[PDB]
């Protein structure tokens, strides 16, 4: 029996990247052919596994992480990357055994005048350790003066909103992302 990937791939709403979403799928068959030819993916890259040989993988669970970022940020969903998304929202380790699929979703995830559902973390103290989820909304202190939960100079709310319009260049348009993580 083949893996139930549509529930994650075809789901109507996707998580914001900072609060990325996690499905455990187990005891099934991951087949590269069926998966790749199911849609028009703009990125599909596997790490530590041979694409041809997904059927031959021997795993208890596959972990399906999904979320939305912008096109220019898709580069960062990969082992050993750096930047906003890879540092403060979603971090892949270097011993990464899985795949990373993505596709332009301007048609689902963009309204004229703006969709603001999708947020990203912009400031954090330490960098994210792989597969760690930070959904805290603590005011980020950039200076010596403490913030006391209030927002202002050197005291920034740590999440901002993509403003997803259809008008944007392809780099700033939304992309849906699924990360298969086998174990």
């Amino acid at each position, epitope marked *: 029996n083949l893996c139930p990937f549509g529930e994650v791939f075809n789901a109507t709403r996707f998580a914001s990247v900072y609060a990325w979403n996690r499905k455990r799928i187990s005891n099934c068959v991951a087949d590269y052919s069926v998966l790749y030819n199911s849609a028009s993916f703009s990125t599909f890259k596997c790490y530590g596994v041979s694409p041809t040989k997904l059927n031959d993988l021997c795993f208890t669970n596959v972990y399906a992480d999904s979320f939305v970022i912008r096109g220019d940020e898709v580069r960062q969903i990969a082992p050993g990357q750096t930047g906003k998304i890879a540092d403060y929202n979603y971090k892949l380790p270097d011993d990464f055994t899985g795949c990373v699929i993505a596709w332009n979703s301007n048609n689902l995830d963009s309204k004229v005048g703006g969709n603001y559902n999708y947020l990203y973390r912009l400031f954090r*103290k330490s960098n994210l350790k792989p597969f760690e989820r930070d959904i805290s909304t603590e005011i980020y202190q*950039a*200076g*010596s*003066t*403490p913030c006391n939960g209030v927002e*202002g*100079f*050197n005291c920034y709310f740590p999440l901002q909103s993509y403003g997803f319009q259809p008008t944007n260049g392809v780099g700033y348009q939304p992309y849906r992302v699924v990360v298969l993580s086998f174990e």
Partner: single-chain antibody
Amino acid sequence: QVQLVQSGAEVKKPGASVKISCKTSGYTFTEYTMYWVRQAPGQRLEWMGGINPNQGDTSYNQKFKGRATLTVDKSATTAYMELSSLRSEDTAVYYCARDGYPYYFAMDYWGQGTTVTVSSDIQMTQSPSSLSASVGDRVTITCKASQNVDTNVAWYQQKPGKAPKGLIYSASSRYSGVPSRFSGSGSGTDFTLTISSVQPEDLATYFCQQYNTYPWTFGQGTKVEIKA
């Protein structure tokens, strides 16, 4: 090494404008906030405002808003401050200083300073205002804050004719390289600076500072004379 290098001295008629610069080197410029501190001739140190070079956001002291404008040029790693419509009250020395957060609180590096010559706030009180000691005495200087400031108090030392240099941040921690004879103390509203075996080179004026909220404020200064 960190270095803050300010533009040279300026002479301006009443009414003119002056844009004094502060060229940084030694560190990631966009990751440290920049403040401007005024020292009117024989007066308290005064925090004028600050700019965050990552975003270009500013906070000004109400006394200096609309007199002063703070900008940066990331491409030149340079902070700028423009004083408009100069009056004679504006003849002073202007310092740029770096917020050392989060490794060392408060202003951990100052510029040489630029002399410009024209022709509910948290109160900080120091005692004594003036002091005379002999090599080897301990000296004690206290600072009373008009409101609670936890341990967000720093002390600076201003040797004669130079910029302030940090000694203590966070009430009791020493800046990098500061001599161990300086120790700071206290909490809440009462702070003390102690110099333990005073050396001739300690001839300086010493200032406390709170950074518990904006605007930052300084004490009036404590002159320390060393008899030989």
